[PDB]
Coordinates of C-alpha atoms in Angstrom, one line a residue:
Chain A
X38 CA 71.4 100.8 84.2
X39 CA 73.7 103.1 86.2
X40 CA 70.8 104.9 87.9
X41 CA 72.8 108.0 88.7
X42 CA 71.6 110.5 86.1
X43 CA 68.8 112.9 87.5
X44 CA 68.0 115.2 90.4
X45 CA 69.1 114.3 94.0
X46 CA 68.5 116.2 97.3
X47 CA 70.3 116.3 100.7
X48 CA 69.2 117.3 104.2
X49 CA 71.1 120.7 104.0
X50 CA 68.6 122.0 101.4
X51 CA 71.0 121.5 98.4
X52 CA 70.2 119.9 95.0
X53 CA 72.7 117.8 92.9
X54 CA 71.6 117.9 89.2
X55 CA 73.9 115.3 87.5
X56 CA 74.5 113.4 84.2
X57 CA 76.5 110.1 84.2
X58 CA 78.2 109.6 80.9
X59 CA 78.9 106.2 79.3
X60 CA 82.6 106.8 79.7
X61 CA 82.7 107.4 83.5
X62 CA 82.1 111.2 83.5
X63 CA 79.9 113.1 86.0
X64 CA 78.8 116.6 84.9
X65 CA 76.1 119.0 85.9
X66 CA 75.0 121.8 88.4
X67 CA 75.0 121.9 92.2
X68 CA 72.4 124.3 93.9
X69 CA 73.2 125.4 97.5
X70 CA 69.6 126.8 97.7
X71 CA 66.6 126.8 95.3
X72 CA 65.4 129.7 93.1
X73 CA 68.6 131.9 93.3
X74 CA 71.1 132.3 90.4
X75 CA 73.7 133.2 92.9
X76 CA 73.4 129.6 94.4
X77 CA 74.2 127.6 91.2
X78 CA 77.7 126.1 90.6
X79 CA 79.4 123.8 88.1
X80 CA 80.3 120.3 89.3
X81 CA 82.6 117.7 87.7
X82 CA 83.5 114.2 88.8
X83 CA 83.9 110.5 87.9
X84 CA 82.1 107.2 88.6
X85 CA 82.8 103.4 88.1
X86 CA 80.9 102.7 84.9
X87 CA 81.3 98.8 85.4
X88 CA 80.5 98.2 89.0
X89 CA 80.6 94.7 90.7
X90 CA 77.4 92.5 90.3
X91 CA 77.6 91.0 93.8
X92 CA 75.3 93.6 95.6
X93 CA 78.1 96.2 96.2
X94 CA 77.4 99.9 95.6
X95 CA 78.9 102.0 92.8
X96 CA 82.0 104.1 93.7
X97 CA 82.0 107.8 92.7
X98 CA 83.2 111.3 93.5
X99 CA 82.7 114.9 92.5
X100 CA 84.0 118.5 93.1
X101 CA 82.4 121.9 93.4
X102 CA 84.6 125.0 93.5
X103 CA 82.3 127.7 95.3
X104 CA 82.9 130.4 92.6
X105 CA 80.3 131.6 90.1
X106 CA 79.7 135.0 88.4
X107 CA 78.0 136.3 91.5
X108 CA 79.9 134.8 94.4
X109 CA 83.4 133.5 95.4
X110 CA 83.9 131.7 98.7
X111 CA 87.6 130.8 97.9
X112 CA 86.7 127.2 98.8
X113 CA 86.0 123.8 97.3
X114 CA 84.1 120.6 98.4
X115 CA 84.8 117.1 97.3
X116 CA 82.2 114.3 97.9
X117 CA 83.5 110.7 97.9
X118 CA 81.0 107.9 98.2
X119 CA 78.8 105.2 96.6
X120 CA 75.5 104.9 94.8
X121 CA 73.2 102.2 96.3
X122 CA 70.3 101.1 93.9
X123 CA 66.8 99.9 94.7
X124 CA 63.3 101.3 95.4
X125 CA 64.9 103.6 98.0
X126 CA 68.0 104.5 96.0
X127 CA 70.7 106.7 97.7
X128 CA 74.1 108.3 97.2
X129 CA 76.0 108.0 100.5
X130 CA 78.9 110.4 100.8
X131 CA 81.6 111.7 103.0
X132 CA 83.0 115.2 102.1
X133 CA 85.9 117.6 102.6
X134 CA 85.4 121.4 102.3
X135 CA 88.8 123.2 102.0
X136 CA 89.1 127.0 102.1
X137 CA 92.2 128.9 101.0
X138 CA 94.2 130.0 104.0
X139 CA 97.7 131.2 105.0
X140 CA 100.1 128.5 106.1
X141 CA 99.8 129.5 109.7
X142 CA 96.0 129.1 109.5
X143 CA 96.1 125.8 107.5
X144 CA 95.0 123.8 110.5
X145 CA 91.6 125.4 110.2
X146 CA 91.3 125.1 106.4
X147 CA 89.2 121.9 106.1
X148 CA 85.8 120.8 107.3
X149 CA 84.6 117.2 107.2
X150 CA 81.1 115.7 107.1
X151 CA 78.7 113.3 105.6
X152 CA 75.6 113.6 103.4
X153 CA 73.0 111.1 102.1
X154 CA 71.3 112.1 98.8
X155 CA 67.8 110.9 97.9
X156 CA 65.5 111.1 94.8
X157 CA 62.7 112.6 97.0
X158 CA 63.3 115.9 99.1
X159 CA 63.8 115.0 102.8
Chain B
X1 CA 67.3 129.7 102.3
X2 CA 69.4 127.6 104.6
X3 CA 72.6 127.5 106.8
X4 CA 75.0 126.3 104.1
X5 CA 73.8 128.8 101.5
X6 CA 73.8 131.6 104.1
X7 CA 77.5 130.8 104.9
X8 CA 78.2 131.1 101.1
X9 CA 76.1 134.3 100.8
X10 CA 77.9 135.8 103.8
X11 CA 81.3 135.1 102.1
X12 CA 80.0 137.0 99.1
Chain C
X38 CA 99.1 132.9 86.5
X39 CA 97.3 130.2 88.4
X40 CA 100.6 128.1 88.7
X41 CA 98.7 124.8 88.6
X42 CA 99.1 123.5 85.1
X43 CA 102.0 120.9 84.9
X44 CA 103.3 117.7 86.3
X45 CA 103.2 117.2 90.1
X46 CA 104.6 114.3 92.3
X47 CA 103.6 112.8 95.7
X48 CA 105.5 110.5 98.2
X49 CA 103.5 107.4 97.3
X50 CA 105.1 107.3 93.8
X51 CA 102.1 108.8 92.0
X52 CA 102.2 111.6 89.3
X53 CA 99.3 114.2 88.9
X54 CA 99.5 115.4 85.3
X55 CA 97.0 118.4 85.3
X56 CA 95.7 121.2 83.1
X57 CA 93.9 124.2 84.8
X58 CA 91.5 125.7 82.3
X59 CA 90.6 129.4 82.2
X60 CA 87.0 128.6 83.3
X61 CA 88.0 126.7 86.5
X62 CA 88.3 123.2 85.1
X63 CA 90.9 120.6 86.1
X64 CA 91.5 117.8 83.5
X65 CA 94.4 115.4 82.9
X66 CA 95.8 112.0 83.9
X67 CA 96.8 110.4 87.2
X68 CA 99.6 107.8 87.3
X69 CA 99.7 105.4 90.3
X70 CA 103.1 104.2 89.1
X71 CA 105.5 105.3 86.4
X72 CA 106.0 103.5 83.1
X73 CA 102.9 101.4 83.1
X74 CA 99.8 101.9 80.8
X75 CA 97.8 99.9 83.4
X76 CA 98.6 102.6 86.0
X77 CA 97.1 105.6 84.1
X78 CA 93.6 107.0 84.9
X79 CA 91.4 109.9 83.9
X80 CA 90.9 112.8 86.4
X81 CA 88.5 115.6 86.5
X82 CA 88.0 118.5 89.0
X83 CA 87.6 122.2 89.7
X84 CA 89.7 125.1 91.2
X85 CA 89.1 128.7 92.2
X86 CA 90.2 130.7 89.1
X87 CA 90.1 134.0 91.1
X88 CA 91.8 133.4 94.5
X89 CA 92.3 135.9 97.2
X90 CA 95.3 138.3 96.9
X91 CA 96.1 138.4 100.7
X92 CA 98.6 135.5 100.9
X93 CA 96.0 132.7 101.0
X94 CA 96.2 129.5 99.0
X95 CA 94.0 128.5 96.0
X96 CA 91.2 126.1 96.8
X97 CA 90.8 123.1 94.5
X98 CA 89.6 119.4 94.3
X99 CA 89.6 116.5 91.9
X100 CA 88.4 112.9 91.5
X101 CA 89.8 109.7 90.0
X102 CA 87.6 106.6 89.6
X103 CA 90.1 103.7 89.6
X104 CA 88.9 102.1 86.3
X105 CA 90.8 102.1 83.0
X106 CA 91.0 99.7 80.0
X107 CA 93.2 97.2 82.0
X108 CA 92.0 97.4 85.7
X109 CA 89.0 98.2 87.8
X110 CA 89.3 98.5 91.6
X111 CA 85.6 99.5 92.1
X112 CA 86.8 102.6 94.0
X113 CA 87.2 106.4 93.7
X114 CA 89.5 108.9 95.4
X115 CA 88.7 112.6 95.9
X116 CA 91.4 115.1 96.9
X117 CA 90.4 118.4 98.5
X118 CA 93.0 121.0 99.2
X119 CA 94.9 124.2 98.3
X120 CA 97.7 125.3 95.9
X121 CA 100.4 127.3 97.7
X122 CA 102.7 129.4 95.4
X123 CA 106.3 130.5 95.6
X124 CA 109.8 129.1 95.0
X125 CA 108.8 125.9 96.9
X126 CA 105.3 125.5 95.4
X127 CA 103.0 122.8 96.7
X128 CA 99.5 121.4 96.5
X129 CA 98.5 120.3 100.0
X130 CA 95.6 117.8 100.2
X131 CA 93.5 115.6 102.3
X132 CA 91.7 112.7 100.5
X133 CA 88.9 110.2 100.8
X134 CA 89.1 106.8 99.0
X135 CA 85.7 105.0 98.8
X136 CA 85.3 101.4 97.6
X137 CA 81.9 99.9 96.6
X138 CA 80.6 97.7 99.5
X139 CA 77.5 95.9 100.7
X140 CA 75.4 97.9 103.3
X141 CA 76.7 95.6 106.1
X142 CA 80.3 96.4 105.1
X143 CA 79.9 100.2 104.6
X144 CA 81.6 101.0 107.9
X145 CA 84.9 99.8 106.2
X146 CA 84.3 101.5 102.8
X147 CA 86.3 104.7 103.2
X148 CA 90.0 105.3 103.8
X149 CA 91.2 108.9 104.7
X150 CA 94.7 110.4 104.4
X151 CA 96.8 113.3 103.3
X152 CA 99.3 114.0 100.5
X153 CA 101.5 116.9 99.6
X154 CA 102.3 117.3 95.8
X155 CA 105.6 119.0 94.7
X156 CA 106.9 120.3 91.4
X157 CA 110.2 118.3 92.0
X158 CA 110.2 114.6 93.0
Chain D
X1 CA 106.6 99.4 92.1
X2 CA 104.8 100.9 95.2
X3 CA 102.3 99.9 97.8
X4 CA 99.4 101.9 96.4
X5 CA 99.8 100.7 92.8
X6 CA 100.3 97.1 94.2
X7 CA 96.9 97.4 95.9
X8 CA 95.2 98.6 92.7
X9 CA 96.9 95.7 90.8
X10 CA 95.7 93.1 93.4
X11 CA 92.0 94.1 92.6
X12 CA 92.4 93.1 89.0
Chain E
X38 CA 72.2 117.8 134.0
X39 CA 74.8 116.6 131.5
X40 CA 72.6 113.8 130.2
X41 CA 75.5 111.6 128.9
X42 CA 75.8 108.9 131.6
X43 CA 74.1 105.7 130.7
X44 CA 73.8 103.1 127.9
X45 CA 73.9 104.2 124.2
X46 CA 73.3 102.2 121.0
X47 CA 74.6 102.7 117.4
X48 CA 73.4 101.0 114.1
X49 CA 76.5 98.6 113.8
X50 CA 75.3 96.4 116.7
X51 CA 77.5 98.2 119.2
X52 CA 76.7 99.5 122.7
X53 CA 78.6 102.5 124.6
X54 CA 78.2 102.2 128.3
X55 CA 79.5 105.6 129.7
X56 CA 80.0 107.5 132.9
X57 CA 80.4 111.3 132.7
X58 CA 82.4 112.6 135.7
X59 CA 81.9 116.1 137.2
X60 CA 85.6 116.8 136.2
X61 CA 85.0 116.2 132.4
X62 CA 86.1 112.5 132.4
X63 CA 84.4 109.9 130.2
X64 CA 85.0 106.3 131.4
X65 CA 83.3 102.9 130.7
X66 CA 83.0 99.9 128.3
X67 CA 82.4 99.7 124.6
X68 CA 80.8 96.5 123.3
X69 CA 81.2 95.6 119.6
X70 CA 78.6 92.8 119.9
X71 CA 76.2 91.8 122.6
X72 CA 76.5 88.9 125.0
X73 CA 80.2 88.0 124.9
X74 CA 83.1 89.2 127.1
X75 CA 85.4 88.9 124.1
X76 CA 83.6 91.9 122.5
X77 CA 84.0 94.3 125.5
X78 CA 86.7 96.9 125.6
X79 CA 87.8 99.8 127.8
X80 CA 87.0 103.3 126.7
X81 CA 88.3 106.6 127.9
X82 CA 87.6 110.2 126.9
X83 CA 86.7 113.8 127.7
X84 CA 83.6 116.1 127.5
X85 CA 82.7 119.8 128.0
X86 CA 81.3 119.8 131.5
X87 CA 80.1 123.5 131.2
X88 CA 78.4 123.7 127.7
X89 CA 76.9 126.9 126.2
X90 CA 73.2 127.8 127.0
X91 CA 72.5 129.1 123.4
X92 CA 71.0 125.9 121.9
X93 CA 74.4 124.4 121.0
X94 CA 75.3 120.7 121.6
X95 CA 77.9 119.4 124.1
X96 CA 81.4 118.7 122.6
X97 CA 83.0 115.3 123.5
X98 CA 85.4 112.6 122.3
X99 CA 86.6 109.1 123.3
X100 CA 89.0 106.3 122.3
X101 CA 88.9 102.5 122.3
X102 CA 92.1 100.5 121.7
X103 CA 90.8 97.2 120.2
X104 CA 92.7 95.0 122.7
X105 CA 91.2 93.1 125.6
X106 CA 92.2 89.7 127.3
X107 CA 90.7 87.7 124.4
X108 CA 91.7 89.7 121.2
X109 CA 94.1 92.3 119.8
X110 CA 93.3 94.0 116.5
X111 CA 96.4 96.3 116.7
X112 CA 94.0 99.2 116.0
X113 CA 92.3 102.1 117.8
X114 CA 89.1 104.2 117.1
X115 CA 88.5 107.8 118.2
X116 CA 85.0 109.3 118.1
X117 CA 84.7 113.1 118.0
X118 CA 81.2 114.7 118.2
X119 CA 78.5 116.3 120.2
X120 CA 75.7 115.3 122.6
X121 CA 72.3 116.8 121.7
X122 CA 69.7 116.8 124.5
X123 CA 65.9 116.5 124.7
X124 CA 63.3 113.8 124.3
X125 CA 65.1 112.3 121.3
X126 CA 68.6 112.7 122.7
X127 CA 71.6 111.7 120.4
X128 CA 75.4 111.6 120.4
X129 CA 76.4 112.5 116.8
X130 CA 80.0 111.5 115.9
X131 CA 82.6 111.2 113.2
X132 CA 85.3 108.6 113.8
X133 CA 88.9 107.6 112.7
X134 CA 90.0 103.9 113.0
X135 CA 93.8 103.6 112.7
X136 CA 95.5 100.2 112.4
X137 CA 99.3 99.7 113.0
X138 CA 101.0 99.4 109.6
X139 CA 104.5 99.4 108.1
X140 CA 105.7 102.7 106.8
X141 CA 105.1 101.4 103.2
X142 CA 101.5 100.6 104.0
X143 CA 100.7 103.8 106.0
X144 CA 98.5 105.3 103.3
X145 CA 96.0 102.5 104.0
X146 CA 96.1 102.7 107.9
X147 CA 93.0 104.9 108.6
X148 CA 89.3 104.3 108.0
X149 CA 86.8 107.2 108.4
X150 CA 83.1 107.1 109.2
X151 CA 80.2 108.4 111.2
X152 CA 77.9 107.0 113.9
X153 CA 74.7 108.3 115.6
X154 CA 74.1 106.9 119.1
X155 CA 70.6 106.8 120.7
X156 CA 69.2 105.8 124.1
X157 CA 66.8 103.3 122.4
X158 CA 68.2 100.4 120.1
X159 CA 67.3 100.5 116.3
Chain F
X38 CA 109.5 99.0 125.8
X39 CA 106.5 101.1 124.5
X40 CA 108.6 104.2 123.8
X41 CA 105.6 106.6 124.2
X42 CA 106.0 108.1 127.7
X43 CA 107.6 111.6 127.5
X44 CA 107.4 115.0 125.9
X45 CA 106.4 115.3 122.2
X46 CA 106.1 118.4 120.0
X47 CA 104.0 119.3 116.9
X48 CA 104.4 122.1 114.2
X49 CA 101.4 124.1 115.5
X50 CA 103.4 125.0 118.7
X51 CA 101.8 122.4 120.9
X52 CA 103.3 120.1 123.5
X53 CA 101.9 116.6 124.2
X54 CA 103.1 115.6 127.7
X55 CA 102.1 111.9 128.0
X56 CA 102.4 108.9 130.3
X57 CA 101.7 105.4 128.8
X58 CA 100.5 103.0 131.6
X59 CA 101.1 99.2 131.7
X60 CA 97.3 98.7 131.3
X61 CA 96.9 100.6 128.0
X62 CA 96.1 104.0 129.4
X63 CA 97.3 107.3 128.1
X64 CA 97.2 110.2 130.6
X65 CA 98.9 113.7 130.8
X66 CA 98.7 117.3 129.8
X67 CA 98.4 119.0 126.4
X68 CA 99.8 122.6 126.0
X69 CA 98.5 124.7 123.1
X70 CA 101.2 127.3 123.8
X71 CA 104.2 127.3 126.1
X72 CA 104.5 129.2 129.4
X73 CA 100.8 129.9 130.1
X74 CA 98.5 128.2 132.7
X75 CA 95.6 129.2 130.5
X76 CA 97.0 127.0 127.6
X77 CA 97.2 123.7 129.7
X78 CA 94.5 120.9 129.3
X79 CA 93.8 117.4 130.5
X80 CA 94.2 114.5 128.0
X81 CA 93.1 110.9 128.2
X82 CA 93.3 108.0 125.7
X83 CA 94.3 104.4 125.0
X84 CA 97.2 102.6 123.1
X85 CA 97.9 99.0 122.1
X86 CA 100.2 97.7 124.8
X87 CA 101.2 94.5 122.9
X88 CA 101.9 95.7 119.3
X89 CA 102.8 93.4 116.4
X90 CA 106.5 92.5 115.8
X91 CA 106.6 92.7 112.0
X92 CA 107.7 96.4 111.8
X93 CA 104.2 97.8 112.1
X94 CA 103.5 100.9 114.3
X95 CA 101.6 101.0 117.6
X96 CA 98.0 102.1 117.3
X97 CA 96.8 104.8 119.7
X98 CA 94.3 107.6 120.2
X99 CA 93.5 110.4 122.7
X100 CA 91.1 113.2 123.4
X101 CA 91.3 116.8 124.7
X102 CA 88.2 118.7 125.7
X103 CA 89.2 122.4 125.3
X104 CA 88.1 123.5 128.8
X105 CA 90.3 124.3 131.8
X106 CA 89.9 126.6 134.9
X107 CA 90.5 129.7 132.7
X108 CA 89.0 129.0 129.2
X109 CA 86.2 127.1 127.5
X110 CA 86.1 126.7 123.7
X111 CA 83.1 124.4 123.8
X112 CA 85.1 122.0 121.6
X113 CA 87.1 118.7 121.7
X114 CA 89.8 117.2 119.5
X115 CA 90.5 113.5 119.0
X116 CA 93.8 112.3 117.5
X117 CA 93.9 108.8 116.0
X118 CA 97.3 107.4 114.8
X119 CA 100.4 105.3 115.3
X120 CA 103.7 105.5 117.1
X121 CA 106.7 104.6 114.9
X122 CA 109.9 103.7 116.8
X123 CA 113.5 104.2 115.7
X124 CA 116.3 106.8 115.8
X125 CA 113.8 109.3 114.5
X126 CA 110.7 108.2 116.5
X127 CA 107.4 109.8 115.7
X128 CA 103.7 109.8 116.4
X129 CA 101.7 110.2 113.1
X130 CA 98.1 111.3 113.6
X131 CA 94.9 112.4 111.9
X132 CA 92.5 114.4 114.0
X133 CA 88.8 115.6 114.3
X134 CA 88.1 118.9 116.1
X135 CA 84.3 119.1 116.9
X136 CA 82.7 122.3 118.2
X137 CA 79.2 122.4 119.9
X138 CA 76.8 123.8 117.3
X139 CA 73.0 124.2 116.9
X140 CA 71.4 121.5 114.8
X141 CA 71.2 123.7 111.6
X142 CA 74.9 124.4 111.9
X143 CA 76.1 120.8 112.5
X144 CA 77.4 120.6 108.9
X145 CA 80.2 123.1 110.0
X146 CA 80.9 121.5 113.4
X147 CA 84.1 119.4 112.6
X148 CA 87.6 120.4 111.3
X149 CA 89.9 117.6 110.1
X150 CA 93.7 117.6 109.8
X151 CA 96.9 115.8 110.5
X152 CA 99.9 116.3 112.8
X153 CA 103.2 114.5 113.2
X154 CA 104.7 114.6 116.7
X155 CA 108.4 114.4 117.2
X156 CA 110.8 113.9 120.2
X157 CA 112.8 117.0 119.1
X158 CA 111.2 120.6 118.6
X159 CA 110.5 122.0 115.1
Chain G
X1 CA 101.9 132.9 120.6
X2 CA 100.5 130.8 117.7
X3 CA 97.4 130.5 115.5
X4 CA 95.8 127.6 117.3
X5 CA 96.2 129.0 120.8
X6 CA 95.0 132.4 119.5
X7 CA 91.8 130.7 118.3
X8 CA 91.3 129.1 121.8
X9 CA 92.0 132.4 123.5
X10 CA 89.4 134.3 121.3
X11 CA 86.6 132.0 122.7
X12 CA 87.5 133.0 126.3
Chain H
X1 CA 77.1 88.7 115.3
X2 CA 77.8 91.7 113.0
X3 CA 80.3 92.8 110.3
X4 CA 82.5 95.0 112.6
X5 CA 82.8 92.4 115.4
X6 CA 83.5 89.7 112.8
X7 CA 86.4 91.8 111.5
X8 CA 87.8 92.3 115.0
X9 CA 87.5 88.5 115.8
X10 CA 89.3 87.6 112.5
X11 CA 92.5 89.5 113.7
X12 CA 92.8 87.1 116.7

């Protein structure tokens, strides 16, 4: 079993609601806060559908563009990471948040960070 | 709410 | 006119063959080298379909998992960046390449870099 | 060829 | 009080032995493993010696080049982050590890990660 | 010969005025704009003083805390990269700019980018 | 002047 | 020992 499909939570208060297809596709909804239509966004990505069997994690990545019918932050985040199975399963990521800028302001276009996702709210 | 969602809400 | 749909090239010898959908979707194929079936991979991502009109670039991102019918590197790259229009149009990105590792080796799981894509090689 | 594609090839 | 001078521990088995000078200097020794001179390296960096008083952390950074009298990995790591005070004091960092490469191999020169340092070992 | 000591320029308008010591030390002044005392800052770092002979670059890194006698941005940048010798010598870097934040705002504390330094002005 | 130095100046 | 230190040692 891939173990990826389902609801995941991070420490920022966000929810990652994902389906992992047999073909390597990640699809679903990313919620930046709960109980607000204005905070729901489309995500799309890819994962390794035939990972190694040597104890290594499963490589994956996805993108959210921060535009919906209510809001547009002129920005996108990509998360790159790996799924780690077990009784305390996790998706460990690093991420890049780029905002649209002028060329003179491009030095301040991109934030970097890390987030761990869990199956129980932290 | 939270800090990240507030940043997005502020951007509007 | 988003300006994104088409063939783009980077300095590593890769080709980014992308379609920008009306609804914000990026789909297409990523080639790590030319003229090899074994070097072609699915990509998927998202872009801002209603960017600012003040001279700012268009935010976007996409992912490739490095598995196809011939190869599997147990790895995925994400590119995060912006499209910049005009006569010398570019997509400027920074990227994260993560490989599957054990927990003890996770410190060495993720490469970081940058690539500019151009409409001419 | 190129370095990045060679790295992918080496992983099989 | 700056709160930075002393011995700090990460989760990788490393120890950061630092002195914060009144002028903004960070100096000391980084140990990639305990108990062996071959694992001890010079570090040098800088910190904000007059941080804000509004609940914000203290910005800092340092470098280790991975060469000593026993070893040379032809590599250097920089840590960029902030010191957070109190009873559970932390230095929270992101890092870049660059190795010397040929121009053809430069795309694979730089690893990225994160480390949290504590005054008590995990 | 290390080739690093001297004046280097980036495309943001900054000047990297560096001395590479025999013991692996980098020292000097970083200017964020030319002709202004308020734009001059201390830097410190480290470099590999015995690089490989196979055509590989020289690994190095340095830090600037953005505080001087006139300004304090409560921030620090680290550059991690490699010196590449030749007729068109350069220092190629990736960098992390961390600002002091409150704990709830840590997710937005760190900008990431890249800069190439040249021996001739852009 | 330039964008990066302007950012630093704005913090005082 | 540990993974990171082992990597450093292997480079000689």
